[PDB]
RNA sequence: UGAGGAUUACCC
RNA sequence: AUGAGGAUUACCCAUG
RNA sequence: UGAGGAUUACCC
RNA sequence: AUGAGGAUUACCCAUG
C-alpha cells in the first residue's frame, strides 16, 4: 500500500483528463499537483490531525486554475487568470468504526453526484430554490 | 429549474439508501434531513453569497450520524461522540462561466471518487502514507 | 412538497371561512395573512431555531382582529377595533423522534378540542373551576 | 358549568388514549396529569388573569414526555432530553364577547388542524420550506 | 407555495430571453441573478419593510449589464462594459386592500407599456418634448 | 412631434380606464394629472439629467390616490383618503445605443409583467416567500 | 450613496 | 435562560 | 426628504 | 473552539 498515489481529478473521458500526482509531504501536508508550471497547476492538499482528545480532523483543499498567457514587460508568461478554491474540513469522532467512516464517504459522494441539487446549483451559477 | 428537492445522500444500491428531504428554507439557507430525530439525522445545508467584489462563495455543511452501536430513537450523549461534521467552502471568481463551474464540480467528484487517495484514507481511519 | 401553503384558520363551515395565505419569509419568519388590508388582516407567523445545543424551539403567533371602520379626519378607514394575540413557544429536545413529535401535535389538538376544559373556559369568558 | 374535569389529551382512537385528570388547584392554577410518575407524566396547567386594564390573559402550559426508548417508571436523566414544553399565552381585550371568544378558539383549532402547515412541520421535525 | 422563483426579465420572443433565477434571501433582501459569469449577469433584488406606522415600503433594484470582454496583458475576462441601474421605492399605506394593490400594479404596468410617453423617451435616448 | 401627451395609466378594459393628461413642463419636470378634482387625481412626473459625465438619469414619480369624501362640520370635500407613492431612478451610461435602451425598457416591463414574482407580491400585500 | 423618512421634484 | 412579567405583539421588562 | 452622486442594499 | 467571517488560500480576522 501507500495511498499516496496519483489520481484523475477531472475526468474528461480519457481526453484532457486532469490527473494529479504526489508532489510533497513536507510538514505532514500531503500535496498533489498537475503537470504544469507551478503557476498554472491544479493543487490538492490533505492533512489529518487529532484536533481534540476525541476527534480527528481532515483538512482538504483543491485549487482549480483558469489558465492564461500574460504579457508582462513585453514578455509572455504562463499564468492563471484566476483560481477557484475548495476548502473542506471533516471532523470525525474517535469512536467511529471503519464502516462508520465509509458512510461519511458515501454521503460525500452522493452529495456531489450529478443531477443532485448542489452540483446542479453550482454548475448553473445559481442557488437552491 | 427548481433544485430544492429530495435526493439520495447514501446510495446502498436501492435497499437501505438514505434519502434526505427539504426541511427548512429560513434565510435562503436550504436544509435537507433524513427521517430521524434531529440527534440521529443526516443533515445537509447550502447557501451562496457574494463573499467579496471578485468572488461568490458556497457554504455546504453535512452532519453524519455514528451508526455502529446506535440505538434508534435513543438519547445518545455526548453529542460529539456520535456525529461527524463536514464543512465545505467553495470560492468561485465572478468570471467563472457555467462551463468553468461544471469543471469545478468534476474536480470535486474526482477528488471523492472511490479508490482515490482521499476517500480511501477517510474510509480506513487513516492519513496519507 | 413545501409546507408553506395556505390553510383555513377559521373554519366557519364553507361560508365566511377565514383562510390565510403565505405572504413573507423574510428573516426566516414565515408569515401568512388573510386577504384584507394589512390593517384588518389576520396574521400567523412561525419560526424555528436551535435554541440550545440540545433543543429546538418553535415560536408561533396568531393575531385575530376585530374589524371596524373608523372616521379619522372626516374620512373613513378600514381598521381593527382591537386584536387578540396568541403567542406560543414549543421547546423540543433534539432526541425526539418523528413519532415523538406526532405525540406533541396530538396533545395540542386534544387540548383545544371542543368540549374539553380549556376551549370551554375561553369561549365562555371564565376560568377553570 | 364546572369545567375542571378529566379529558383525553392524546386521542389514539379509544385504544391507548392518554387521559389527563385534575391534580392540583393551588392558587387558582388548574393542573391535570396523566397516571405516571411526574418525570414521565403528560402535564397541563391553566390560569386566567387580567394582565392590564384592557386585557385578560390565559397562561396554558403543557409538558409532553419523549416516549421512544422510554423505560416506564425509570430514572431518565437529563430531564431536558426527555421532555417537550409548550407555553401558550392568549391575550384577549376586555371587549371580546363570548362570540368573539368562540372565534379565537376556532382560530386556534384551525392552526393546529391536521394537514395544516404548522402541525406538519412539527410532526416531521421540520421548519417551513 | 413560493414566489421566490425563476422568471423571465427580458422577453425576447422565446429565444434570447433573459431569465433570472433565485440566488440569495439574506436579511430580507431577495436576490435573483441570471446565469453564466456573475460579472455579466442581470441582477434583481427586492425587499419590504414597515417604513412607518402606516406604511409598508418596497425597494426593487434591477441591473442591466452591457456584456463585453476585457483584455489586459493578453488575459481576457468576461465583464460588463458598464451597467444601467434601476431603483424603485413603492410606499403603500396599511389601509390598502388587495384591490387597491392590484390597481397600483396596473398603474405601474401602464406607465411602462409600449407606446406610452415614458418607455418611449427611454428606448430612444430621449426626454419629454 | 411630441411625447408629452395624454396616456392611459390604468387600463381597466375600456371603461374605468384612468387617463392622465399633460399639465405642466416647468424646469424640465414634465407633469401629467388625471381629470376632475386635483385632490383626487393621479399624478405622474418625469425628468432627465446628465447625473455625471457618463450618466444620464431619469426620475419618474407616480401617485395613486384612494378616492374618498371628507366630511367636516357638514361641509364635505372630495379628497384622497391616502396616496401610494412610486419613485424610480434609472441611470443610463452615455454609451448606450438605442438598442441598449430598448432592452432596458424590456427588462422593466418584464419585471412588472403579470405573474412574475414582484407584481404578484405587491398586488397581494406580500413580500417574497 | 443609504432595503434612510415623507404631507412626495420635500426633508435626513 | 427563566417569569400564571407587560405590549401598542418577531417588541419591551426583570432576574440569572 | 432631496428631478442629490454612485464602482449600486454604498455614500451625501 | 466557534463564524452562510475574508483571502492574494496550509494565510488573516473576530469572538470565546
Q: What is the CATH number of the domain that holds C4?
A: 3.30.380.10
| Smallest CA–C1' distance to I8, residue | E85
- CA distances to D36, D111, F27, F49, F114 from F60, in Å: 70, 44, 15, 12, 21
- Cα–Cα distance, F9 to F24 (Å, whole number): 17
Exposure string for C23-40, b = 16+ CB within 10 A, e = fewer: bbbbebbbbbbbbbbbbb
Q: Contacts of residue F44 in chain E, CB cutoff 8 Å?
A: 111, 118
Tally of CB atoms within 10 A around E94: 20
CB of C58 within 7 Å of some strand H atom = no
Q: Does B70 touch chain A (CB under 8 A)?
A: no
Residue listed under C-alpha cell 386594564: D53
Which backbone phi and psi does B108 adopt, to 5 degrees?
Answer: -70, -40
Protein CA E51 to sugar C1' G4 (Å):
9
Residue listed under C-alpha cell 435537507: B32
Region class of A94: left (phi > 0), else alpha (psi between -120 and 50), else beta:
alpha
CA nearest neighbour of F57 among F83, F90, F30, F100: F90
Contacts of residue D103, Cβ cutoff 8 Å, sequence gap at least 6: C10, C64
- For F97, the 3-state DSSP assignment is coil
B-C contacts at Cβ under 8 angstroms: 42
- For A118, the 3-state DSSP assignment is helix
Contacts of residue D64, Cβ cutoff 8 Å, sequence gap at least 6: C103, C104, C107, D42, D83, D84, D85, D86
Its domain, for residue D76, covers 1-129
- Cα–Cα distance, F81 to C74 (Å, whole number): 10
- Cα–Cα distance, D18 to E23 (Å, whole number): 47
CB of C95 within 7 Å of some strand H atom = no
- Cα–Cα distance, C81 to D95 (Å, whole number): 10
Residue listed under C-alpha cell 395613486: F64
Q: Which DSSP letter does residue A25 get?
A: -
CA nearest neighbour of F42 among F57, F23, F14: F23
| Strand H nucleotides, any atom under 7 Å to a protein CB | 1-10
Query: In the complex, which nucleotide's C1' lies nearest to the CA atom of residue E49?
Result: G3
Contacts of residue B80, Cβ cutoff 8 Å, sequence gap at least 6: A54, A55, A93
Q: What angle do helix axes D98-112 and C98-111 make, rounded to 10 degrees?
A: 170
Which backbone phi and psi does A63 adopt, to 5 degrees?
Answer: -120, 120
Classify the C-alpha dihedral D24-D27-D30-D33 as positive or negative: negative
The C-alpha cell of A67 is what? 489558465
> Can you point out the beta strands (E) in B1-129?
7-10, 18-24, 30-33, 43-49, 55-65, 83-93
CA nearest neighbour of A119 among B3, C56, D32: B3
| Pairing state between β A18-24 and A30-33 | antiparallel
Residue listed under C-alpha cell 419613485: F87
Contacts of residue C72, Cβ cutoff 8 Å, sequence gap at least 6: none
- Cα–Cα distance, C66 to C78 (Å, whole number): 11
Cis peptide before D78 (omega within 30 of 0): yes
The C-alpha cell of F75 is what? 361641509
| Beta-ladder partners of E80 | E67
Q: Which of C3, C10, C12 sits opposite D126 (nearest CB)?
A: C3
The C-alpha cell of E85 is what? 441601474
- Cα–Cα distance, B68 to C97 (Å, whole number): 19
- Cα–Cα distance, C88 to F103 (Å, whole number): 50
Residue listed under C-alpha cell 378600514: C78
Q: Which DSSP letter does residue C30 get?
A: E
The C-alpha cell of F108 is what? 422593466
Exposure string for B39-59, b = 16+ CB within 10 A, e = fewer: bbbbbbbbbbbbeeeebbbbe
Residue listed under C-alpha cell 357638514: F74
- CA distances to A9, B86, B87 from A87, in Å: 15, 11, 8
Residues 19-38 of C with CB under 8 A from E: 21-22, 24-27, 35-38
- Cα–Cα distance, A129 to A117 (Å, whole number): 9
Cβ-contact E28, E37 below 8 angstroms: no
- For F85, the 3-state DSSP assignment is strand
- For C121, the 3-state DSSP assignment is helix
Q: Which of E1, E81, E90 sits opposite F86 (nearest CB)?
A: E90
| Pairing state between β B83-93 and C7-10 | unpaired
Nearest-CA distance C128 → chain F (Å): 40
Which contacts of A52-55 are long-range, i.e. CB under 8 A and separated by 24 or more positions? A54/A93, A54/A94, A54/A95, A54/B80, A54/B81, A55/A91, A55/A92, A55/A93, A55/A94, A55/B80
Give the CA dihedral A118, A121, A126, A129, nearest 10 degrees. Answer: -70
End-to-end CA distance of chain F: 46
Protein CA F52 to sugar C1' I6 (Å):
10
Total count of domains within chain C: 1
Contacts of residue B63, Cβ cutoff 8 Å, sequence gap at least 6: B41, B42, B43, B83, B84, B85, B86
- Cα–Cα distance, D106 to D129 (Å, whole number): 26
- Cα–Cα distance, B90 to A111 (Å, whole number): 14
Residue B128 half-sphere exposure toward CB, CA atoms < 13 A: 25
- CA distances to A113, C122, E20, E113, F3 from F7, in Å: 55, 57, 31, 10, 10
- CA distances to A9, B81, C13, C117, D54 from D97, in Å: 72, 56, 21, 19, 14
Alpha helices in chain B (DSSP H): 98-112, 117-123
Tally of CB atoms within 10 A around A38: 9
Q: What angle do helix axes B98-112 and A98-111 make, rounded to 10 degrees?
A: 170
Cβ-contact F47, C50 below 8 angstroms: no
| Smallest CA–C1' distance to I5, residue | F51
| Pairing state between β B55-65 and E55-72 | unpaired
DSSP-assigned states of every residue in C43-61: EEEEEEE--SSSEEEEEEE
Q: Which residues precede a break in chain A, with C-to-N distance above 2.5 Å? A: none
CA nearest neighbour of A8 among B35, B123, B107: B107
Q: Does C97 touch chain D (CB under 8 A)?
A: yes
Residue D112's Cβ-count burial label (10 Å; 0-12, 13-18, 19+) is buried
Q: Contacts of residue F67 in chain C, CB cutoff 8 Å?
A: none
Classify the C-alpha dihedral E62-E67-E71-E74 as positive or negative: positive
Q: Does F41 touch chain E (CB under 8 A)?
A: no
Which backbone phi and psi does F93 adopt, to 5 degrees?
Answer: -60, 155
- Cα–Cα distance, F82 to D64 (Å, whole number): 50
Tally of CB atoms within 10 A around C103: 23
- Cα–Cα distance, D38 to D47 (Å, whole number): 20
- CA distances to C29, E31, F20 from C4, in Å: 11, 20, 41
The C-alpha cell of E64 is what? 442591466
- Sheet containing strand A55-72, edge to edge, reads A7-10, A18-24, A30-33, A43-49, A55-72, A75-93, B83-93, B55-65, B43-49, B30-33, B18-24, B7-10
CA nearest neighbour of B117 among A20, A91, A109: A20
- Sheet containing strand F7-10, edge to edge, reads E7-10, E18-26, E29-34, E43-49, E55-72, E75-93, F75-93, F55-72, F43-49, F29-34, F18-26, F7-10
- Cα–Cα distance, B96 to A126 (Å, whole number): 12
Tally of CB atoms within 10 A around D25: 12
Tally of CB atoms within 10 A around B78: 9
* CA-only gyration radius of chain E, Å: 18
- Cα–Cα distance, B28 to E26 (Å, whole number): 6
- For C113, the 3-state DSSP assignment is coil
DSSP-assigned states of every residue in D44-109: EEEEEE--SSSEEEEEEEEEEE--TT--TT---SSGGGSEEEEEEEEEEETT--HHHHHHHHHHHH
Protein CA B22 to sugar C1' H8 (Å):
37
Amino acid at each position: 500500500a501507500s495511498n499516496f498515489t496519483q489520481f484523475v481529478l477531472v475526468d474528461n473521458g480519457g481526453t484532457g483528463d486532469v490527473t494529479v500526482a504526489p508532489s510533497n509531504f513536507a510538514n505532514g501536508v500531503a500535496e498533489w499537483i498537475s503537470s504544469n508550471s507551478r503557476s498554472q497547476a491544479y493543487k490538492v492538499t490533505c492533512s489529518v490531525r487529532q484536533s481534540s482528545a476525541q476527534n480527528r480532523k481532515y483538512s482538504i483543499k483543491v485549487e482549480v486554475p483558469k489558465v492564461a498567457t500574460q504579457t508582462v514587460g513585453g514578455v509572455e508568461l504562463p499564468v492563471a487568470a484566476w483560481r477557484s478554491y475548495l476548502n473542506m474540513e471533516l471532523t470525525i469522532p474517535i469512536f467511529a468504526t471503519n464502516s462508520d467512516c465509509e458512510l461519511i464517504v458515501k454521503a460525500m459522494q452522493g452529495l456531489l453526484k450529478d443531477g443532485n441539487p448542489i452540483p446542479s446549483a453550482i454548475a448553473a451559477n445559481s442557488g437552491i430554490y
